[PDB]
Design a protein around this ligand. Structure first.
Ligand code: MH0
Ligand code: MWJ
Length: 137
């Protein structure tokens, strides 16, 4: 299930982090407006760009931390406060996170792997709820 999926993603994190974020940017091309330096690049060119690789892996590093600290796919309130407070997240509405998890769940369903996609769906919803409580509009 969910706990084994955290280990599976961590075992090849840079690839999963990049492939899931590309899934997200290609499903929701308007989210590029938060990522001006990614506009007008193919997936292969994005994988060539320093901030892309390094920022995507740091995002997923923290995402797997928040997943690991969760109980029954409910993140800690402290982890929601961190995500809301962070300067880099000034722009952001819960909708942005909801779209990221919609793309993450679709990626997992399309893989031949026994990912617990329902758990990730619940995780995304619960994190969105936690982000709202901690004040994100
Ligand atoms: C689609 C909007 C959006 C969503 C959703 C989002 C969701 C998440 N975030 Fe995070 N984040 C978003 C937009 C940004 C921006 C715009 C930046 C600025 C850095 C950059 O390189 O673009 C950023 N996030 C930056 C970060 C960084 C630091 C990157 C760096 O500068 O090296 C971390 C660790 C991070 N986030 C955490 C997370 C986690 C964890 C999640 C999932 C729960
Ligand atoms: C800055 C950033 C945000 C998300 Br969500 C995914 C990857 C990435 O580099």
């Amino acid at each position: 299930g969910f706990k084994q999926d955290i280990a599976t993603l961590r075992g090849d994190l840079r690839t999963y982090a990049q492939d899931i974020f590309l899934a997200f940017l290609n499903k929701y091309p308007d989210e590029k407006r938060n990522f001006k330096n990614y506009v007008g690049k193919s997936d292969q060119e994005l994988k060539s760009m320093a901030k892309f690789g390094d920022h995507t892996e740091k995002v997923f590093n923290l995402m797997m931390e928040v997943a690991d600290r969760a109980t029954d796919c409910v993140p800690l309130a402290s982890d929601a406060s961190t995500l809301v407070q962070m300067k880099q997240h000034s722009g952001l509405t819960t909708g942005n996170f909801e779209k990221l998890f919609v793309a993450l769940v679709e990626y997992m369903r399309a893989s031949g792997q026994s990912f617990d996609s329902q758990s990730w769906d619940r995780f995304g919803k619960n994190l969105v709820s936690a982000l709202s409580s901690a004040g994100m509009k």
